[PDB]
Paper text:
The C-cluster is the site of CO/CO2 interconversion and is composed of a [Ni-3Fe-4S] cubane connected through a linking sulfide (SL) to a unique iron site (Feu). Here, we report the crystal structure of the CODH from [name] (DvCODH), which reveals a surprising and unprecedented conformational rearrangement of metal ions in the C-cluster and provides the first visualization of the cluster in an oxidized state.
Pre-formed crystals of as-isolated DvCODH (batch 2, containing the altered cluster) were incubated with the reductant sodium dithionite. Strikingly, the resulting crystal structure displays the canonical C-cluster with Ni, Feu, and SL rearranged into their catalytically-relevant positions. Remarkably, oxidation of the reduced C-cluster by exposure to O2 results in reformation of the unusual cluster architecture, whereas both the D- and B-clusters remain intact. Together, these results suggest that this altered cluster is an oxidized form of the C-cluster and that this multi-metal ion rearrangement is reversible. This C-cluster rearrangement from oxidized to reduced appears to involve what amounts to a ‘molecular cartwheel’ with Ni, Feu, and SL following the same trajectory to end up in their canonical positions.
Numbering used by the authors:
A (entry chain A): 4 to 627
B (entry chain B): 4 to 628
The structure:
Amino acid sequence: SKTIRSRSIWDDAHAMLEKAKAEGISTVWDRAAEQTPACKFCELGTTCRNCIMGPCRIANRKDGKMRLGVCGADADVIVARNFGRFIAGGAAGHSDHGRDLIETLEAVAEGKAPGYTIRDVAKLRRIAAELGVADAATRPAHDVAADLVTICYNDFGSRRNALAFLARAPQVRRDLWQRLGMTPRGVDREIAEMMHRTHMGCDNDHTSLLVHAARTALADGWGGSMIGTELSDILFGTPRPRQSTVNLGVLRKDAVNILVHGHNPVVSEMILAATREPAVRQAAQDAGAADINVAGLCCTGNELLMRQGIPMAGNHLMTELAIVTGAADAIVADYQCIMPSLVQIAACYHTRFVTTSPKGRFTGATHVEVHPHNAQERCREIVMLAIDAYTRRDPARVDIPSQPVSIMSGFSNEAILEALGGTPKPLIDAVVAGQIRGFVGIVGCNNPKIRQDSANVTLTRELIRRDIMVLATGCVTTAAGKAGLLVPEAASKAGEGLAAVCRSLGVPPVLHMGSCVDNSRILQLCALLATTLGVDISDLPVGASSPEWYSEKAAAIAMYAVASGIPTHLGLPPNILGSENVTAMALHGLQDVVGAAFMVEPDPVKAADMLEAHIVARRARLGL
Amino acid sequence: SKTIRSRSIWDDAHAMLEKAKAEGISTVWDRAAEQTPACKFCELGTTCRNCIMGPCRIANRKDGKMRLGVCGADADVIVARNFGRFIAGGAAGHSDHGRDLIETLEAVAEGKAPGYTIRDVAKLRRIAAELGVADAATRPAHDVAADLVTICYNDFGSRRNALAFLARAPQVRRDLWQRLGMTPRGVDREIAEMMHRTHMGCDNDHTSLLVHAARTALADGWGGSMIGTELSDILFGTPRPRQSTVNLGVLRKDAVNILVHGHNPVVSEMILAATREPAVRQAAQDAGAADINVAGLCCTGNELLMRQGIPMAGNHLMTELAIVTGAADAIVADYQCIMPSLVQIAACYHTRFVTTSPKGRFTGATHVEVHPHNAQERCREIVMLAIDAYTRRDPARVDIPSQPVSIMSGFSNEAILEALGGTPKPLIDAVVAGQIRGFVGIVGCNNPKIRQDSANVTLTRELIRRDIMVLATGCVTTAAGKAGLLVPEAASKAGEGLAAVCRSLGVPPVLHMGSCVDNSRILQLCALLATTLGVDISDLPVGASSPEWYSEKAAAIAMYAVASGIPTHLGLPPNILGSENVTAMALHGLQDVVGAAFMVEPDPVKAADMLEAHIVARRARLGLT
Ligand code: SF4
Ligand code: SF4
Ligand code: FES
Ligand SMILES: [Cl-]
Ligand SMILES: [Cl-]
Ligand SMILES: [Cl-]
Ligand SMILES: [Mg+2]
Ligand SMILES: [Mg+2]
Ligand SMILES: [Mg+2]
Ligand SMILES: [Mg+2]
């Protein structure tokens, strides 16, 4: 089918799209077509629904009418407020994620989280000492954890002048933030202040609104997400390199297939542990299965991949198709990016759709709520539901379409530094020598507006060919993985300089650095490289790119990348083009404020040219 | 003009609308007409922009298309998420306001706020003791203040199971909230969680979303707003009854007129103090003025009215018209409900438009930022800017249209209890005897969709005629004031029972209880009455109404009133009618969950009937006639 061919580059997606059509199942692509064309005001950002003096629409008319909202706000204010709330929603997703990790580490410290423990005590003592816990090296681990919990919770309070992890950024960058009024102070506080500023008659200056949008996003990258990443490593282990597989072929016809979907490893790690219990495995055998097969979707899949090597079934636009295989015995979801259509598609089969979070409620789902105190018992209950669902699987509707593709995951900063011998000097030397011209983090989503993973894969191939190492996170992981680029042998696809470094280290030219919260690792790596060189992050040969983004979370990541000094490419524009001034600020003006700006370019080859050009200019700023 | 008559019931508004039209000045009414008809999907709530898989619209088409967003979300989810973010924006406005008061009290306790003091130490010690500060009755005031600051900041953290002031609610109500998952835990936390829940692929159950909307609003009424009110009383004094005046006639042709606008008294109290410095008064006289004349707009005006008796120039839809008088020499703004049109209208005159908050930035304004450590110095600079602007006032463009109307303000709960002799017993006795059949808080805004204050005033008149005492806050204050209902003599307009009680106490039938954050005073009063009677707030003969609301803050107030058990009337619907299920939950389903629901009724006489009928039903359950 020509329609099916245009929706994805992958054979496993094509096969399930044909199967979905044959069974009359509507997918995200079908609903995207129904919503095209979109409302032009909504797409431009020139619409406001923030009070019931409105709603209002703005147009650039010669007769002067509809130039202002009822309150008098112009297009610049309305667009900037909409963008600010958009970013705030993204930051809030990461904020609540990080908060849940704090609450879990606290439950461990109190001895009230059966089945949870401190799995990297060394990192616990290191992070606690870094953030100022007294005698972190020698005090009992639970006491050190309790003090770290208090520091993290205080960053979710209203009394700080700067977030705890912000001290990682170079001094020149913290000084710049302080002067600009951009320093993030509290993870929840910046979000709440954004919602206040965007109320009618509060912040009515587009520049001020965008500066606080930067501050809100920085409170994510250096706050909610960084706390999420570092505490997840403490609770579940610091990732180290390991082999795994990717695509729908990780599902097994002869096993109980449990797909974990969503974001928080507090749930998926305990689902995994439940499947490994002897009596639970025995119950699956008694049902006729060969074993229990856990496979990951989206970010929680990234987390199990990074720490346990659990194979990943797919990314955002693969989620509906994973159920269409007919082999998904249960989906276990927590929150964020879980399309509610999955509840209806699961209803077409035997599949149990299980929700686990009080925040991720889906009408018609099977709710088995999970908290640290009951997770071990509840996750065992959930696996038994999956085994019971497996006994009702219709074999005539099963179609697992592909063979899995080998990948290498686990590239935490700890893992990168260990592969380098313990210091960043061999990496710095390769950059100075020009073997590695720079680094680009390719992050973010899929979007039905772009043929699935076409731009993600093309940009990855273009960059490594130009001796630019790629750091992959989020749903881009599945793209690079299915393209064969997450293995050391993919050095054959890189330019001469990058291939030589990769082969000397035994690593791929594309390093999987984790989930979307683990974009905080890229911030940490840039801060480390800048501090070692005595420069700003805005002087490093780095870039960021989300060629196929969709979510508010992705926009917040892009904003905190830009605000931290990292030129950031987006394949698609945010809904801001109705304000020329807001657009010019995002694409150009921010360069003169924070030392980086957004780029919007749907051609991934042209995006590669633009990212490379910034890297070249940065290499000149360093006199290379 | 028939068009001008239809926009407001007030002569001062009519006069300035005529003047604005003659000078070619566009007002909020003119822009409301340009924006009518509105977008159908935006009006119904059936549109979503929460990701760039969209934007999406939900339609009812024969081919069945556009029933779902690209992610699969239906109309119920989209409408509920939109209403949830709407509520979170209102809660956030009050939240940041309360936070600023915490930071001000902390600066005072540290001795780093020249010109600020603890004006009500007795209330400081009482509130601190109520919230658990050890030895609040005896320790040094600055130590007690530091400990109270810590308790208030902890409610803006992420470690509480319940907000500190929630203990005021009766146990039965706290038990209900706890079972429902509605207990507010952290003022910022609930707002952040709402923004998370409304991200694509998180909370996709409309009942769940509305329950968290209730929790988010409760974190305002029992958190951000109540902290704001109580700390404002501690810093600037507990309101007591006093006389003042209202309407555009409070401006003086012979004076430097400084209009304070916005919400935070931390600024307007220090502007007022600066105008009272002898050297600053002398500068105004040397410029030709008789004096400096501070007048209030919107909530910061309510604040200065309640605590200093400062006359109030007008409410929401009067704000542009106050500049059209040609006598506004400076507008001093902080944040919230400040229409950016005021910047352009000021530019048509000599008026200086001064912003004072890092949060309230206006392109083209004169920014003179104010913080506790520099407010005394900066507010003096702002008043000197106003005196300079006065020297450039064009006398030929001045038209102050009316004579001011006398009002009585200052009815804090402390003042009400003092008028009752120290206890609520005489008020309960009047309620039991049926002299006062019930109480209704009339709160909230103006809205160009309704002839200004027509519904505010008609509802107030209808209720007091039916022996229902009215508690007025926000922009309703100005409406009742200009109607002549905020004075003791207005008992003549109430029914026989309410008139007798009012005359025995010497109070008006309409009690001004302050600004929009001071709607927390109404929550405190209901909680006190419920606890004294041993019932829930949902058992009290009470109601709430915003006949002419517009803001997200007003919806958050309505939501936390409903969630606390207060039947709440809105003159206009929120943008939710695109979902019958969400609408039915708001208007009916909540009744069975929290003991109260929303009502939507644009006819203020019918609104009076519905509010009274709820009051009659609650009086029956108390065993009264
Ligand atoms: S805030 Fe202003 S632009 Fe937005 S809906 Fe209200 S009146 Fe219209
Ligand atoms: S969240 Fe769902 S309904 Fe909203 S814009 Fe995105 S795809 Fe459309
Ligand atoms: S749907 Fe109302 S403006 Fe786009
Ligand atoms: Cl035109
Ligand atoms: Cl508590
Ligand atoms: Cl009722
Ligand atoms: Mg706990
Ligand atoms: Mg500033
Ligand atoms: Mg301070
Ligand atoms: Mg619950």
